[PDB]
Amino acid sequence: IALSEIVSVVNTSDGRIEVFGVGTDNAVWHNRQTAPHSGSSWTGWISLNGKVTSKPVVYINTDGRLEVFARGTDNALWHIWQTATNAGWSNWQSLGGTITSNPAVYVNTDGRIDVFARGTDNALWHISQTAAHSGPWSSWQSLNGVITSNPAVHINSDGRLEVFARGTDNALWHIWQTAPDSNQWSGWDSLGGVITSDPVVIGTADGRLEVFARGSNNALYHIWQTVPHGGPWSNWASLNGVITSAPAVVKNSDGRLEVFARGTNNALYHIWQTVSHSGPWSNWATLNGTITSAPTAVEDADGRLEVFARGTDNALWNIWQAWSAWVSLKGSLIDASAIK
Amino acid sequence: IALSEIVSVVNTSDGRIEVFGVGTDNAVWHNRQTAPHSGSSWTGWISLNGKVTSKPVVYINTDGRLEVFARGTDNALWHIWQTATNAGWSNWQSLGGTITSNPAVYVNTDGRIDVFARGTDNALWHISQTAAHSGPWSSWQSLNGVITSNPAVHINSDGRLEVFARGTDNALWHIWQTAPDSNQWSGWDSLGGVITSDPVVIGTADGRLEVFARGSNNALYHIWQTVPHGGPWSNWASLNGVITSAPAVVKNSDGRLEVFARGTNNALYHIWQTVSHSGPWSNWATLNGTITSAPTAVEDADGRLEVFARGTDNALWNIWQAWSAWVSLKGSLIDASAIK
Ligand SMILES: OC[C@H]1O[C@@H](O)[C@H](O)[C@@H](O)[C@@H]1O
Ligand SMILES: OC[C@H]1O[C@@H](O)[C@H](O)[C@@H](O)[C@@H]1O
Ligand SMILES: OC[C@H]1O[C@@H](O)[C@H](O)[C@@H](O)[C@@H]1O
Ligand SMILES: OC[C@H]1O[C@@H](O)[C@H](O)[C@@H](O)[C@@H]1O
Ligand SMILES: OC[C@H]1O[C@@H](O)[C@H](O)[C@@H](O)[C@@H]1O
Ligand SMILES: OC[C@H]1O[C@@H](O)[C@H](O)[C@@H](O)[C@@H]1O
Ligand SMILES: OC[C@H]1O[C@@H](O)[C@H](O)[C@@H](O)[C@@H]1O
Ligand SMILES: OC[C@H]1O[C@@H](O)[C@H](O)[C@@H](O)[C@@H]1O
Ligand code: NA
Ligand code: NA
């Protein structure tokens, strides 16, 4: 499994990027832009406390309240939430279970958050809010299978959640809701290939799921739905390169997909659709730097991509689509990924 | 009340703009882009039938299914929906009531559509889906007040719906949910001024509501929340000009607000935030043409603004942010607005 993303990042409901990482104390720390603009100053790192043994994953509830999910020292799923949109936080609360992966998080069309995690049986399990952005939470329920990666989740353009994970054959497997808001899940399907990273999944500007992963030759690969929210899937296509981290994918403000990955020389590299969305891909270009994590990419409130990655000093470094000079957000981050 | 928008327009879940208008037969007709790109060809006009006595208002359910709301010849609220995302349509069904305005439509954080309409008592009434993108619908419920315009609705950045309408004093009044998904609504509040158009409301890139309306001197005015999802509101500010239609507002792909209105010479005019979102406004610029409706503006799948307006030939004409040459979508549209 290629070197993981070190932070979870979201553009908040007031247009400020907030990042969540694990400190040397194994607590979750957050940093937020002071202003909703490219090159904004930052609040600085503020602790949510806790003791996590996974990558923390933030998600924005449909009412704008941020909610962080992370495995605890007891291997239970824990969570903590803003009590008001972009305001104070709750205490950490357990959702129980015994999980063996980072959580994957998305929200159903009914505003109910769905959290996916590998179990001690190596099956995909999930637990959900029973009301929109509200407790109580459901029971833990199994979707079966045997997965050898952290899971990834994205909603289809018809509101059906779809989960991607590596199988015991190192192929990309996936499973989907057969209707929105449903616990009627499909059987597992193999999209084949051999992946040596966690999969990442995004929705194209024309409403198709597209999955990126590193292959056995350390090139970037991708595969996509050929119709909106539907099969068949394309064959695997190489985007080439030699990458030494997990890839991070993001949509430009004009819908062009752009992928960030660490190269052999430990610099940040990127490759993008040219002209328009679902257009022909560029060749790889360097953004330089020296990074000790996978990059994490998000669009800011000015419609510019922002990239975060840990540096050799273990601080979180930022670069944005002007491109800008590398700047440090400081702090000291660790890779707490449940699967490495 | 300044000349109204003639179509309801949405960017569908597969990145194709679809427009809804009233034909000379008083049926609702729709036209959709063949491709999810600027300057795409169109399907041509296809009838949903019905007999409407209001502007038709389309909304995308959280599962991607389009749903159109319009007053019938019996003055009841009627609706029709796609049975699958971007697929076939249902028959028209009545939601009953007796309404005296165009419908205003938004979705709650729980995926429940909320429809607002003036009653025969000139009070603001509403009816909602009781489950996410699903029937049965609620009873009609009154929010009281006396309104002299079509209502406008937008969600706050904390998930609270907020409705704007002109009062008997010709001032801008508003009312809001005190919590998301709630029928706990606030009292009416006056934002003062004198408006001679329907209000239009948008959410800024930094999570604030901003309202645009024509004033007594036929200038464009605007007023905004000074904090995300919160008061106090600004004082009214003039964006000047002399406009002879309702203004239409839209966010650029980079969050810059842009406003479209008909000028004294019947040409399309526009004015925009410069540099970045919540930045200083341009002066008015012409896009020429000769229009016989207010313009309607939406962002396409390429991140470019598209504007629609009826021409002197009663066809719907299109121009986009390249700017492009005016092109005709043909058809023959009427202004069916319930309040003129
Ligand atoms: O108050 C809202 C919060 O309530 C908690 O009980 C739930 O577990 C959270 O998921 C929710 O966001
Ligand atoms: O029914 C829809 C489903 O069809 C399957 O064949 C595809 O592999 C899934 O990605 C899709 O969600
Ligand atoms: O076409 C725009 C593209 O051009 C490149 O020069 C930039 O570095 C990319 O981030 C961008 O997506
Ligand atoms: O629809 C086909 C296109 O989908 C895009 O999102 C992919 O990145 C392209 O490689 C592909 O040609
Ligand atoms: O099937 C979905 C549709 O069902 C109808 O009964 C409801 O009235 C619509 O609002 C809904 O979109
Ligand atoms: O409580 C929030 C509400 O506060 C009021 O003072 C504002 O006028 C409303 O726009 C806002 O939604
Ligand atoms: O800064 C970009 C702006 O420049 C003007 O020339 C265009 O006509 C506007 O549509 C655009 O928003
Ligand atoms: O926050 C203040 C700013 O809000 C913007 O959305 C308005 O268009 C500006 O006129 C105003 O200066
Ligand atoms: Na994340
Ligand atoms: Na509309």
Structural write-up:
The structure is a homodimer of 340-residue chains. With 340 residues, chain A is an all-beta fold. In chain A, 0% of the residues lie in helices and 42% in strands. Chain A has strands spanning 7-11, 17-23, 28-32, 46-47, 57-60, 66-71, 77-81, 93-96, 104-107, 113-118, 124-131, 134-137, 141-142, 152-155, 161-166, 172-176, 189-190, 200-203, 209-214, 220-227, 230-233, 237-240, 248-251, 257-262, 268-272, 285-288, 296-299, 305-310, 316-320, 327-328, 333-334. At the A-B interface, loops of A face loops of B. The complex binds beta-D-glucopyranose (8 copies) and sodium ion (2 copies). One sodium ion binds next to loops of chain B.
Category by helix and strand content of chain A:
mainly beta
Beta-strand content bin of chain A: 35-45%
CATH architecture of chain A: 6 Propeller
What is the count of β-strands of chain A? 31
- Tell me the number of structural domains of chain A: 1
Q: Terminal Cα separation of chain A, in Å?
A: 6 Å
Number of helices of chain A: 0
